[PDB]
Structure formats: C-alpha cells, structure tokens
Write an enzyme that holds these catalytic residues in place. Structure first.
Site, PDB file in Angstrom:
ATOM      1  N   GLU A 153       0.802  -1.210   0.000  1.00  0.00           N
ATOM      2  CA  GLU A 153       0.000   0.000   0.000  1.00  0.00           C
ATOM      3  C   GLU A 153       0.847   1.277   0.000  1.00  0.00           C
ATOM      4  OE1 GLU A 153      -2.102  -1.438   3.517  1.00  0.00           O
ATOM      5  OE2 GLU A 153      -3.839  -2.155   2.354  1.00  0.00           O
ATOM      6  N   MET A 165     -13.052 -10.367   6.958  1.00  0.00           N
ATOM      7  CA  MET A 165     -14.453 -10.797   6.742  1.00  0.00           C
ATOM      8  C   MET A 165     -14.607 -11.685   5.508  1.00  0.00           C
ATOM      9  SD  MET A 165     -16.071  -9.398   9.214  1.00  0.00           S
ATOM     10  CE  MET A 165     -17.721  -9.501   8.537  1.00  0.00           C
ATOM     11  N   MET A 203      -9.367  -2.988   7.881  1.00  0.00           N
ATOM     12  CA  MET A 203      -8.897  -3.256   9.234  1.00  0.00           C
ATOM     13  C   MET A 203      -8.222  -2.074   9.932  1.00  0.00           C
ATOM     14  SD  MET A 203      -7.478  -7.263   8.708  1.00  0.00           S
ATOM     15  CE  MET A 203      -6.492  -7.789  10.236  1.00  0.00           C
ATOM     16  N   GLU A 204      -8.262  -0.859   9.367  1.00  0.00           N
ATOM     17  CA  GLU A 204      -7.578   0.287   9.978  1.00  0.00           C
ATOM     18  C   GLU A 204      -8.326   1.597   9.892  1.00  0.00           C
ATOM     19  OE1 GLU A 204      -5.903  -1.365   7.277  1.00  0.00           O
ATOM     20  OE2 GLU A 204      -4.923  -2.774   8.648  1.00  0.00           O
ATOM     21  N   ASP A 229     -11.031  -7.723  -3.010  1.00  0.00           N
ATOM     22  CA  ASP A 229     -11.865  -8.904  -2.912  1.00  0.00           C
ATOM     23  C   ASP A 229     -13.289  -8.452  -2.624  1.00  0.00           C
ATOM     24  OD1 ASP A 229     -10.336  -8.446  -0.168  1.00  0.00           O
ATOM     25  OD2 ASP A 229     -12.169  -9.488   0.360  1.00  0.00           O
TER      26      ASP A 229
HETATM   27  N1  LIG Z   1     -12.384  -8.908   3.277  1.00  0.00           N
HETATM   28  C1  LIG Z   1     -11.619  -8.079   3.979  1.00  0.00           C
HETATM   29  N2  LIG Z   1     -11.823  -7.971   5.312  1.00  0.00           N
HETATM   30  C2  LIG Z   1     -11.034  -7.148   6.013  1.00  0.00           C
HETATM   31  N3  LIG Z   1     -10.049  -6.358   5.592  1.00  0.00           N
HETATM   32  C3  LIG Z   1      -9.867  -6.487   4.272  1.00  0.00           C
HETATM   33  N4  LIG Z   1      -8.952  -5.832   3.496  1.00  0.00           N
HETATM   34  C4  LIG Z   1      -9.156  -6.289   2.216  1.00  0.00           C
HETATM   35  N5  LIG Z   1     -10.129  -7.166   2.111  1.00  0.00           N
HETATM   36  C5  LIG Z   1     -10.583  -7.304   3.411  1.00  0.00           C
END
Ligand SMILES: Nc1ncnc2[nH]cnc12
Ligand SMILES: Nc1ncnc2[nH]cnc12
Lengths: 228, 227
Positions: B18, B150, B171-172, B195
C-alpha cells in the site's frame, strides 16, 4: 529482590477516572499534560517516579495513550490497572487477577493461518514481564483477553469460552497496551479486579462495583510500587 | 491565500504493497523507525509529506497515527490501501471514497451506545469534506473497520444487517479516524477493492492486493497535485 532488574520510572495506565482517581490522589504535586485526548500525571507516588495515564476506553484509545506515554515519557515499564469481567469458576466481585499474558479475544485473521486471537504480524499472545508478575504476586494468575465489546450476552460468552478455555477474565484494553509495549519493546503487566461476573446482571454489576474494582486494582499497584 | 490549503500531508498505509509506489516517487526520503512503524519524510508530487507504514489492524494503525500526529503534525491524514467489497455493484479494483468511517466490531450497546460506537467516542468519524471533494475530482459512502478478515458467511450477514449502508470493510480506517478525532486533525480514507464479500476472498486478496494498493495510491498522487 536483589537479583531482579530495576524499574526506575514506572508508567501506569487506567482507562477511566474511577480507575486512576485514588492513584492520582496519592501523588505529590502532580503535573498534568493533556494530549491526544488522554491525560498524563507526572510525579512521585509511593516513593517511585511515575507517569499515571488516563487513557479512555477501548483498544484504540489505549493504544494512543500507551504510544504517547512511551514516546514522550519513556518509562521503564507499564502497568495497566482497572476493572474486568470474571469468567473463571471461583471469581467474585472485587477479586484480583494478575495477567501472565494477554490475548485479543475478538481478533480473527484465521483465514490466513493465524491462531484465533492473533493479529497479523504480531505474536499470538503478549506475555507480561516475569519480574512484574512476581512483584504483583508478592503483594489468581493467568490469561486475560481483550476485545472492543462489553461481554454480557450468552452467545458471546460461550464463544469466547470456547476459543479460550483458559481465559480468566475479559476487558477492553490490556492486550492493546501489551501489543504497543511489544512494538516499543518495553516491559508491561496487567492487573484487574472483577467489576462483574459472566452471566450475572453485568450491566448493573459494573455500574455498582466499577469503583470497588478500580480501588482493589489500584491498591495492588500501590503495594507494587512500594516493592520496586 | 484564502484557499483551503493543507501544507503538510500525512499519508498512511498498512502494508508495504500500500505504500511502495508512494515512497518510490518521493524525492530522497528520510526514513525513521519508531514504535514498530516507519515514517518517510520528503516531497512528493510537489507536496511536503510524511508517508507512514503502520502495520495491520486497529492497534498498529492507532500507534502509527498517534506518532505521526504528535511528532510531525501534518495538516491532514489520508489513509490508502485495499478493502473488501459489500456494495451490490462493487468489483475487484473499484475505488471507494469514505464519507465516514465506523467500526463494525465495536459493541457496547449494553450501555446505550449505538452499534459500532465506542464508549466516549462519536458513533461515526466523518471524513473532511474538502478532502472528499478533491478525491472525487480525481462511489462515496460508508466503510467499516474491524480486527477481522471478513470472509465467513455468518460474519458477512451480521455486518450487513448491522450496517445496511456499509459499502466495504477493512482493518484500519476507523482507528485512524478515531485518532484524528482525538487530535482534531482532518482525514480521509480511500480504498480499492482487493476482494468481494462471498467470492473466494482469501485467494482474491493474495492475487489483487498489489494492484489494488497501487490503484488507491494513484488516486492519492492525483490528489496531492490539487491540494
Ligand atoms: N475482506 C476483507 N476484510 C477485512 N479487511 C480487508 N482488506 C481487504 N479485504 C478485506
Ligand atoms: N463484562 C465486561 N466486558 C468487557 N470489559 C469489561 N470490563 C469490565 N467488565 C467487562
């Protein structure tokens, strides 16, 4: 004892006023620093140089407070004090638990092969310092888990118990403090007292006994300082 | 001037993927290692910046952001990286600009707070409206943050029911927003999708994290020319 390392500047962190008020009142002419939404009190307490920290609640606030405590005041260790929810069989309100190690109970990157509770790029657990643990003991010992949830619903408690059968209690900052100390490489310890017991009218229990929990935990810390 | 100007710009990404492009377009950056994080100072696309590699998760991002603010005092913080997509018409590589960040895993509702609202904090952390407009000129809405990857169906369903307008997760972002709230510093989160919820997310993530991180960072580089 004679063979133990020394800790000349002690950092102490509590989340809430009820968890730091007594300790602050026993400090000698404390300086106050307001920063990042936290407060830091610098002065002498029970014969030790200390920086007492009121962090706020939860992983993020605890992390901020611990980062700033370490970067700005560089204490030789960090002791977290406060309240927790009891899980182990024979715990009663007001009982004290000393953490041998902290884990997160709500972290889950197991899809990539990490252990339950283990954050990516982090160890699965954060052991408390061997010296500090023994000092607290000299004044139950085991696993405390941290999460950003107040745990009182049957399903949540059952899942946590299933993921961590050896968890003695739960709270909302200790493993964050431990992770930050790991990232700075600084000794730490968590001491907590039970303000509520899993499944037993926990909201009302917490409201009624947060102050006696904060007091019992803080009294342990005061005795620890007497022996450091 | 009288222009809404941000003179020193903080930029934070969780992983090497990133931040790598951003760092590589910096003019002879200085590197600092502190608190398990890295900070690179220098000029980038004309702007004075501090680029931060924080590590993954709420605790690491919080350390990184609190150090960035206290030691460097940027005028704004922009978070870049990848996320998981929940919105109906979201696809691999699509960018989402956050209007606000919330935590999807915080629960102190037993004490009256809203779902996702941490005690003593606001329920949501709105991103700076100027930063949002600049990003747009280079989907907009809610992104949620938790310390979980997730991909399990029941977890996706709980999050959708809790936050029906959540467009993506990571996540941040909300940790960065909370620290910036605690310090009163404007911020923005920009993510590209690596994703999509329900669709082989682990393998997708491993295959698309590099290109998604680059896409997000390319938005940021565009933004810095107009700030
Ligand atoms: N599915 C996901 N859950 C949490 N953080 C992510 N970052 C990228 N994809 C993610
Ligand atoms: N039940 C509980 N859950 C989480 N943190 C707590 N701190 C004290 N009691 C708690």
């Amino acid at each position: 004892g004679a063979m133990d390392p020394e800790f000349m500047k002690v950092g102490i962190i509590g989340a809430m006023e009820q968890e730091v008020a007594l300790l602050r009142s026993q400090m000698s002419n404390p300086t106050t620093l307001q920063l990042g939404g936290c407060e830091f009190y610098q002065g002498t307490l029970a014969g030790k140089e200390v920086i007492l920290t009121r962090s706020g609640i939860g992983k993020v606030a605890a992390s901020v407070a611990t980062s700033l405590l370490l970067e700005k005041f560089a204490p030789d260790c960090v002791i977290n004090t406060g309240s927790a929810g009891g899980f182990a069989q024979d715990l009663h309100i007001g009982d004290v638990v000393i953490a041998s190690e902290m884990r997160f109970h709500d972290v889950d990157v197991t899809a990539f092969g990490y252990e339950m509770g283990q954050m990516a790029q982090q160890p699965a657990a954060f052991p408390c310092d061997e010296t500090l643990i023994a000092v607290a003991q000299d004044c139950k010992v085991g696993l405390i888990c941290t999460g950003d949830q107040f745990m009182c619903k049957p399903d949540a408690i059952a899942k946590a118990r299933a993921d961590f059968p050896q968890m003695l209690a739960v709270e909302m900052e200790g493993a964050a403090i431990g992770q930050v100390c790991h990232m700075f490489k600084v000794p730490y310890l968590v001491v907590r007292a039970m303000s509520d017991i899993a499944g037993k009218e926990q909201v009302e229990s917490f409201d009624a006994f947060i102050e006696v929990a904060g007091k019992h935990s803080a009294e342990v810390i005061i005795k620890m300082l007497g022996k450091l």
